[PDB]
RNA sequence: CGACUCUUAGCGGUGGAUCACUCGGCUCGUGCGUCGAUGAAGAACGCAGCUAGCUGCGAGAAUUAAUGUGAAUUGCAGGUUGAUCAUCGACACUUCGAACGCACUUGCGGCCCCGGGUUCCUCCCGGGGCUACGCCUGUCUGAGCGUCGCU
RNA sequence: CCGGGGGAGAGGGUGUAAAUCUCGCGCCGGGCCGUACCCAUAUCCGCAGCAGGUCUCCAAGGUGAACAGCCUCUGGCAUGUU
RNA sequence: GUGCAGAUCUUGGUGGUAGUAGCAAAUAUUCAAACGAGAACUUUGAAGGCCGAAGUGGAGAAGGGUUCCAUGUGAACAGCAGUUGAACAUGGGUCAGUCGGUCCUGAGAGAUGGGCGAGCGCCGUUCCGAAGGGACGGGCGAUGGCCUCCGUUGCCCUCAGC
RNA sequence: UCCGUAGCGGUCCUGACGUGCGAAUCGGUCGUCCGACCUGGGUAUAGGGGCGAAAGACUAAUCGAACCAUCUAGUAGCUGG
RNA sequence: CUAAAUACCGGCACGAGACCGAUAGUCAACAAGUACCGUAAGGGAAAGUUGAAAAGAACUUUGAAGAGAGAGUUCAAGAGG
RNA sequence: CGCGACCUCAGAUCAGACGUGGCGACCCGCUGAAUUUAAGCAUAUUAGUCAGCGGAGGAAAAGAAACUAACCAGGAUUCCCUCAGUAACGGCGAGUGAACAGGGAAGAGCCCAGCGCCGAAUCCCCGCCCCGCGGCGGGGCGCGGGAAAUGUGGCGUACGGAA
């Protein structure tokens, strides 16, 4: 009754995808997210998963704007002047 | 929305419109039906906007 | 169900999207390993999640 | 024609939106006629209208951002678009000035005291 | 003699060992040592003539401008006053996210200014700018059978 | 959402009457999201087209106490991985 | 990081068993024709049967996510086969003021004030709170139009429970 | 309250099956079927904790202390190489 | 209040090696934190090599086709995606 | 009753600023075990270590003696060698365990409050004029506004200092 019988039952969901980490860990019913946490400002994230901390670190994602400043460091972060035009 | 695309079509196509039933297909595309005033025909319009 | 929402229906959308084959021409190019999608996905076999 | 950004810096805006709202209608053309499937020269020429498309607006905008610098340029208070954007720990710095300022009592001991400079016979 | 079985060799299959390669790792060392409310990290969704993934990019969407370079890109088509690459200092940068009008259904607003509507008469529609918390200095409006002074 | 009790008020000086109307018509508008199909001895969960599990609506004729069992009509199916 | 036969060693590959166990729950199929290279299994007609209104019928909720529909294919899958399929490949398909969501509150969840806490934070939901940004009538002020008469916002008097 | 259907449950055959339809099913036979009844959805209680008409039962096929990661390559006078 | 000498398995850009050579070396030489699994926290692979150059086998013939037989390319198909 | 100060406390989509979150190898402040060893085990050991929490920087922290010493004395902090597996702690069992002196790498010193003297001699903000203007500054005006005597600035700080 336990196993095969009783697996027939599983027809309402506890976690939904989540709006900050886009995980499918957001409990319903305890409006929190598993992954991230998302109510909580912090973003949840442990010393003992070294592994979870890998990822999602700053170099998985796409760094839209970190290899931009990367890029401008080089330069002394100039800005409002042009090249010498022809 | 519905006031937009009709404002829209009312722009491009100089003509003016019934209604506008929109539906959002599983490609994800939003497809819009606009009906027209019954004195302009909706054929002739296609013709001169290149669908035929 | 039939009871969608929108983000759900919008998600469905971009995993129906993926979901075809490889043109044909992908594979005349020169620096290419690709021999045919492995990423794909049937209804019947793989859940999805959600 | 091909649609140069060198020739557009000296027109007016209004004849930029002009051009602007003609090669709008010239995707919405393209567009009809790849959906109803056309020539290839013709599918070929919407990768040519969408980027004249981004150079006209390319130079309304430029043109426009130059404006607004020119106007704020003498003024206390700018807007943060128009305020330089280094890095958020580099804009919270002191200045020049702030950095360059000592105390009376400093200028005085670098006055009375300055570093000399001398050698040592072997 | 024949079938079946055993051994060895030739050839052929099954299998991918060995060897030779290596735009990958591991380790050591050097220089620099730079994120974010001017909206980070992360996520979502889109963008190619034919495009699923990876990569790149953001409705200007496998990129715009400028500079250097100098005749290509290419799987197939199409079309030197500068094709393509590289640099990148100008411009732009959808949605969620510290995430900011209230909530997170993608829902309900409020104030102000514009354009149709109207002809300031409120409706209606579209667009733009504001509307989070804490805290510093100053301003304005206030409270007190708090301490007083004067009519 | 409505009815009642109260009566602060408003309206006109005898009329091209006024304030007012929950009466009859006339004008304009209603934005956003979901909507296909399966819903079960094959579209869900049990590693699968698994004799298991999974919430409901409709409910003909005869026999009969009967939504029992058996036969039949509308509808459906091909004997349940040969 | 130097020699393997073993560690119910690790990974990968292959045998005997073995063309064997098996393809046996829910009564049942038969004849003719068509398409085709090919028919026990596809389609059509004629039978004989079953489910027998608490159905093997007709519609929904949850869940699934294109499985729905049309055409083509028979490589792989559908434990025989297939001309067939929920398989593959091309194309299509979900239209609302009235049907639901959206609004309300339920059990309950959960900020602020406050309290606790080394701290992320936690407790607590009216409890140690100056918690109302509103309205009618009047006075004052300005605006815009038959500046007639309403409307607009600025200040004050007044009133207000939750 | 009794017989008894749907529903809920699971006595006996210690039947079938037992590299099964099935990591608990099937057949006949059975208990109950107006009430301490059955059931969907929402919500509350979380691990030395919950919850228990009490079997150490249940707490995602895991229960006399669930599951995941880390401390951890824990130690072994013992077994095998 | 205060530089220097000191620390640096993260980041950017580099150089080197008595290291490993696709069951090794990072989990990852490849569309790798990807496919896939679990409600979840998390777990987590396998997978390099035609040739110098696609010159990647035109055409004939059997078969419905997969498949063959000739012919042809190449130094070599005893290198046939 | 009213008016005007000051104090204390509110409300603003008031004018101008700042904080939040991420990464976290190295650093700072807490919190903090049990495996293990003691051939058992309880003090100890593991270990102020793993896990947990907060906060930064290109380094951080520390730092110019309420010091070391007992000498013919040295003289901020940080790091290396040595002191030293030493003094010492420890069911004095298992085990744990520094510092001074010495040799080097580097070397840099300083400022307030108080006590006093100077007419608050000091600081911030808004309006205008010209310049700089892409790390918002300079002088000139304003019978402009505030902060500050419940104390700003100059001299001056233990090496003495002031007149
Ligand atoms: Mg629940
Ligand atoms: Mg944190
Ligand atoms: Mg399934
Ligand atoms: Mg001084
Ligand atoms: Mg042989
Ligand atoms: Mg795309
Ligand atoms: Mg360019
Ligand atoms: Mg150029
Ligand atoms: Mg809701
Ligand atoms: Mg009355
Ligand atoms: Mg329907
Ligand atoms: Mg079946
Ligand atoms: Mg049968
Ligand atoms: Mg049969
Ligand atoms: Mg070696
Ligand atoms: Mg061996
Ligand atoms: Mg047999
Ligand atoms: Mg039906
Ligand atoms: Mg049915
Ligand atoms: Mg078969
Ligand atoms: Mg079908
Ligand atoms: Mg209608
Ligand atoms: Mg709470
Ligand atoms: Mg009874
Ligand atoms: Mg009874
Ligand atoms: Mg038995
Ligand atoms: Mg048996
Ligand atoms: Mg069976
Ligand atoms: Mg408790
Ligand atoms: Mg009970
Ligand atoms: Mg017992
Ligand atoms: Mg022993
Ligand atoms: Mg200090
Ligand atoms: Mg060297
Ligand atoms: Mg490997
Ligand atoms: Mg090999
Ligand atoms: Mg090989
Ligand atoms: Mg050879
Ligand atoms: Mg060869
Ligand atoms: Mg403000
Ligand atoms: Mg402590
Ligand atoms: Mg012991
Ligand atoms: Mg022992
Ligand atoms: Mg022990
Ligand atoms: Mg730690
Ligand atoms: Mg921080
Ligand atoms: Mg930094
Ligand atoms: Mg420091
Ligand atoms: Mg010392
Ligand atoms: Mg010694
Ligand atoms: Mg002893
Ligand atoms: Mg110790
Ligand atoms: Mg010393
Ligand atoms: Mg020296
Ligand atoms: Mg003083
Ligand atoms: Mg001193
Ligand atoms: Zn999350």
Known sequence: TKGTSSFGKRRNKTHTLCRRCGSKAYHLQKSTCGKCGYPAKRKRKYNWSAKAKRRNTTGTGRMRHLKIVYRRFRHGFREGTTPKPK | NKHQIKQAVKKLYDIDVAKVNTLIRPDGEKKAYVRLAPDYDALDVANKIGII | SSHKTFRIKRFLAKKQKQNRPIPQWIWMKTGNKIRYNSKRRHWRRTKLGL | ????????????????????????????????????????????????????????????????????????????????????????????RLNKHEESLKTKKQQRKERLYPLRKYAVKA
């Open chain 4, 1 to 92: 024609a091909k649609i140069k950004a060198r020739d557009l810096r000296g027109k007016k805006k209004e004849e930029l939106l002009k051009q602007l709202d003609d090669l709008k209608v010239e995707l919405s053309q393209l567009r009809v006629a790849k959906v109803t499937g056309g020539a290839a020269s013709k599918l070929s020429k919407i990768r040519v209208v969408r980027k004249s498309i981004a150079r006209v607006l390319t130079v309304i905008n430029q043109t426009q951002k130059e404006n607004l610098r020119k106007f704020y340029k003498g003024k206390k208070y700018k807007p943060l678009d128009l305020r330089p954007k280094k890095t958020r720990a580099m804009r919270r």
